[PDB]
Amino acid sequence: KVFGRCELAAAMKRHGLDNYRGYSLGNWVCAAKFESNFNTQATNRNTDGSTDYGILQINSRWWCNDGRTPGSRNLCNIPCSALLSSDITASVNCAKKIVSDGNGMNAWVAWRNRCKGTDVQAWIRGCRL
Ligand SMILES: [Cl-]
Ligand SMILES: [Cl-]
């Protein structure tokens, strides 16, 4: 599923991401835009052979099991394929563990490079939340 901006904001808001660890909702929408273009089915392969999955491009190196990232961890205890669902619950729940791991949203390269220090509230402007 390819979400609309406001549709995704509202789904994220319902799943407790607004202000989660001090990150306002615009941060999460912005990250999703630049990570996946709001497409729950996004995959991208990293040079190390790990893969990034779903709306927030969560990496098989640490976070999920895809059966083909030898010597990786499954810290969110999920098949990576569950991150590709049109229901973003598993992505959001895993994202919460990532953002809590000490690096905040800096874990998301596109967040760091494209959202951080910008006006992120613009990403939810206009939305009925
Ligand atoms: Cl694996
Ligand atoms: Cl980037």
Per-domain boundaries in the chain: 1-129
- With CA atoms as reference, report the closest residue to 54 among 25, 28, 91, 27: 91
Hey, which residues are catalytic here? Answer: 35, 52
Method: X-ray
Six token digits for residue 91 = 């992505």
CA 18 to ligand 1 centroid distance, Å: 32
- Residues 79, 30: Cα–Cα separation, whole Å: 25
Domain 1-129 bears CATH identifier 1.10.530.10: yes
**Within 2-124, where are the H helices?**
5-14, 25-36, 89-99, 109-114
Which whole-number Å values give the CA distances from 119 to 13, 16, 38, 49, in the listed order? 18, 21, 19, 34
b/e 34-60 (16+ beta carbons within 10 angstroms → b) = bbbebebebbeeeeeebbbbbbbbbbb
Resolution (A): 1.8
Asked if residues 27 and 117 have their Cβ atoms less than 8 Å apart, the reply is no
Query: Which positions make up the binding site for substrate?
Result: 101
